[PDB]
Amino acid sequence: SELDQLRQEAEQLKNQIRDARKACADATLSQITNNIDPVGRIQMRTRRTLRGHLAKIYAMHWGTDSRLLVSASQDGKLIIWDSYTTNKVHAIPLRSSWVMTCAYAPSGNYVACGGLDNICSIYNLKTREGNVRVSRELAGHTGYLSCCRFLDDNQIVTSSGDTTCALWDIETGQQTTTFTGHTGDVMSLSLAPDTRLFVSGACDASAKLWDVREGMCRQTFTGHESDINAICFFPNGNAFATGSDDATCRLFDLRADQELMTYSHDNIICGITSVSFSKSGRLLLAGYDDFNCNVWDALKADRAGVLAGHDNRVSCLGVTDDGMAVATGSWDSFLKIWN
């Protein structure tokens, strides 16, 4: 037939891609960093317990003031917390019980959430009548909402189980750009500091780099052996990290267009649910289904420390913009702040 006179073309083009990258692979990061001082024993402790959700917590997200955060739970509520005190700024009963993700807008004026409703719902946190209310219901996706992030108060990028991501215009209420390419449910996404690019992670075991204005996949990173659950940009915006059901995190570089590092250990068998970097990028924190968060030396690949204070899966985590603190959310129903 015709089809196999271009399925060979595809698999021939995949080699040229390997070749180009293999020719860039002159040294390893591990080799380059072998000289610098180890980070030492990072021994953080739990400084707050946030107690309000009645069931598993599926997603957390710090606000840009390194103080407030949002969390989405199996109990069908979002809770916005003031981490400095433990107080609750808002309890938001959702219309659908099945929420999976949540996001805090940079300005502090909105939060977003979604799940098996297949809808990204936006909540106005300062109504011109002094209440908290749904201000938009972004419908379009044909699968569940897995992750989402505001660019500003009028734009948001969502990832879905239908295999697509999309940039939205909040007032128009429609997909201003669609990002097709993945062959499996998209599980997570992270926006580059400039918000010009963004990366996604999916059950096809690949991460892809996207251009916001153009709506196109620039680069595609393979290497994981199983679903990618979490993904995260390195602070300079030139590399990123992923966490997978294969029990590993990996660090990818955009300009080298390939994988720099793998963080794993024979004793760590369960899968990664979440990832982020300390402010400088030296540390890569990672949550696991074994109820721990591990702290890796991003540059040397050694396990620097463990956060052990949850009685069920660590479902989500986040490092504050000011670098002061790490928040961990868990299926045990608590968030803890460590430092």
Binding site: L54, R95, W98
Partner: protein
């Protein structure tokens, strides 16, 4: 206390779903129940302007149907036409068909005014009420109130403490009839008790069984001339039938005191028994035991046909067995292996009427146990009539007492309608006989073995007859209890405003169902069932504890000491018990919890973020 107390309005969430599951939330089904009607009209008459003049018009027609004479009907037909037809029409407010208007007017102009003159308007009124009007009704308190009442109905478990016995008024061979008053309402009833020890001894289970099954077929339709049942129930020792009360004794007893009756007095009882028979034959039941002892009198002297032990359902298969008292059986009945139907009673009647007039059966000539002589006189002697009889009466008896079924009255033609059209009854107006308005001739004066393989023969014996219970309630406690529980709720509404009312926690989400149940750790809490969890709370707090659908492994019904409860098995090898306040509540939580969790686990399994892994 021993008084009726309605459940709180939140029972709606559960009952509404219970009734929808059974297709009982429809205009037809609600409108044709007494308490549903009464609640439906109140909504229409007071709380919706468009529906007022439909209900008003409807009830004006229903009054029109019952009017007795034609001079009355001529007059009221005009009032209805001027008011509900010409007025609405002149006010451009008459939503009825062109044909509807011309049916009534075509008749009214010719001064022809039968009871059913307005039937076309009945249909179209129902059409106008059945849509939008009916849905707005479902939205309102009045439907909530239907639910509260319906809840009580579907929760009835009758005992002895639910009645107050006054006096004995009979001994049967298996048990004894009592007089009582149902504490609930104050309604006066008779209570026929039977003993399972005696029944077992005298071998009459099939006789006991038949009477319950035959009474359910008879006791719908509020017939004046049958002793009917409202309830039946079991205890470890005895069966109960709660039947219509009749203080007056039986015609066999009164035939004894008074002596043989006038032709004009027998006619009164005749008229009444005939309408009692029309009832059972319309419902494919032949009595087979018509006689004076089986006809009871009330305190005014009106009559009702009584014990149904030997009656038969001929809808499907026609009986051939010889059954009944020997002096009042038909030739069909006596004949070995020959099928028959409503014909058998018409002969029996013929015999019972002759009995009353002359003191004995036409076929009995003082022979006591020699039944055979009564049977051969029934089959050969076409019975002989005294000169004293009237010729009007002569032909009625001759008609009823023809030996061949192809000849007799109420048989080859049109059932009871043929008997009513005899010249003997030509004076009578059967609408008056029915409304019990003819004056009665006689007013009564001043008054060790039990197995478990026998108990199962009497399951399914308990029964409540909706039409019956609703009538009792409507004619007694209904209005005062409605106003009473209105009064409570308005103050409960007024209570919560000051104590910071819950701007209800069920609203604006995806709550499936909610309501009170009790749990253990009893503990009475309010539950909210959501697609992925079951929350609950005490009063004055939000729910601060829950159970997820994921962790539920099974939902069993289980007995917790003479009491049926739900047993949720949980993943941890953990058990969770729930008790409801009523069978409907139970049944609907079992169903909705099972469907919720089976469906939830089906979902979570598809979602890689949510399901559990190795």
């Amino acid at each position: 206390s021993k008084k009726i107390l309605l459940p709180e309005p939140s029972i709606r969430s559960v009952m509404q779903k219970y009734l929808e599951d059974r297709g009982e939330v429809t205009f037809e089904k609600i409108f044709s129940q007494k308490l549903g009607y009464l609640l439906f009209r109140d909504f229409c008459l007071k709380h919706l302007e468009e529906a007022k003049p439909l209900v008003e018009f409807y009830e004006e027609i229903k009054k029109y149907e019952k009017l007795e004479t034609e001079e009355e009907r001529l007059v009221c037909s005009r009032e209805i036409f001027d008011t509900y037809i010409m007025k609405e029409l002149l006010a451009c407010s008459h939503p009825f068909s062109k044909s509807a208007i011309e049916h009534v007017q075509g008749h009214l102009v010719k001064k022809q005014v039968p009871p059913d003159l307005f039937q076309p308007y009945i249909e179209e009124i129902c059409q106008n009420l059945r849509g939008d009007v009916f849905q707005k009704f479902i939205e309102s308190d009045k439907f909530t109130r239907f639910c509260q009442w319906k809840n009580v109905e579907l929760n009835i478990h009758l005992t002895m403490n639910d009645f107050s016995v006054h006096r004995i008024i009979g001994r049967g061979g298996f048990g004894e009839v009592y007089g009582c008053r149902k504490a609930d309402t104050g309604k006066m009833y008779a209570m026929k008790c039977l003993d399972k020890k005696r029944i077992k001894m005298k071998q009459g289970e099939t006789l006991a069984l038949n009477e319950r099954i035959m009474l359910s077929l008879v006791s719908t339709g509020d017939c004046p001339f049958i002793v009917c049942m409202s309830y039946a129930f079991h205890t470890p020792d005895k069966l109960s039938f709660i039947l219509d009360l009749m203080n007056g004794g039986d015609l066999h007893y009164h035939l004894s005191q008074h002596g043989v009756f006038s032709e004009a007095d027998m006619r009164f009882y005749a008229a009444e028994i005939i309408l009692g028979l029309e009832h059972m034959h319309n419902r494919f039941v032949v009595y087979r035991d018509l006689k004076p002892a089986n006809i009871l009198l009330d305190e005014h002297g009106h009559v009702r046909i009584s014990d149904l032990g030997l009656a038969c359902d001929f809808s499907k298969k026609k009986p051939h067995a010889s059954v009944g008292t020997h002096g009042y059986m038909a030739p069909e009945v006596l004949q070995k292996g020959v099928a028959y139907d409503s014909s058998a009673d018409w002969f029996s009647l013929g015999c019972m009427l002759f009995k009353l007039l002359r003191g004995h059966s036409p076929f009995r000539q003082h022979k006591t146990k020699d039944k055979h002589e009564i049977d051969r006189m029934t089959l050969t002697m076409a019975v002989e009539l005294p000169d004293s009889f009237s010729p009007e009466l002569r032909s009625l008896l001759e008609g009823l007492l023809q030996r061949d079924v192809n000849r007799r009255l109420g048989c080859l033609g049109r059932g009871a309608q043929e008997v009513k059209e005899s010249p003997f009854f030509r004076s009578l107006d059967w609408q008056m006989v029915f409304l019990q308005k003819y004056p009665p001739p006689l007013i009564p004066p001043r008054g060790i073995k039990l197995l478990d393989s026998d108990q199962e023969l009497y399951r399914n014996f308990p029964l409540t007859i909706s039409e019956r219970w609703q009538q009792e309630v409507a004619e007694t406690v209904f209005d005062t209890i409605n106003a009473e529980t209105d009064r409570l709720e308005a103050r409960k509404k007024t209570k919560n405003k000051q104590l910071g009312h819950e701007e209800d926690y069920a609203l604006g989400k995806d709550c499936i169902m909610h309501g009170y149940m009790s749990k253990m750790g009893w503990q009475r809490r309010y539950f909210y069932l959501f697609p992925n969890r079951l929350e609950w709370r005490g009063e004055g707090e939000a729910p601060q504890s829950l159970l997820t659908m994921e962790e539920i492994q099974s939902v069993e019904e289980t007995q917790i000491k003479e009491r049926k409860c739900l047993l949720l098995k949980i993943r941890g090898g953990k058990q969770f018990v729930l008790q409801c306040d009523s069978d409907p509540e139970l049944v609907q939580w079992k169903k909705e919890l099972r469907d919720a969790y089976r469906e939830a686990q089906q979902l979570v399994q598809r979602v890689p973020k949510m399901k559990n892994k190795p």
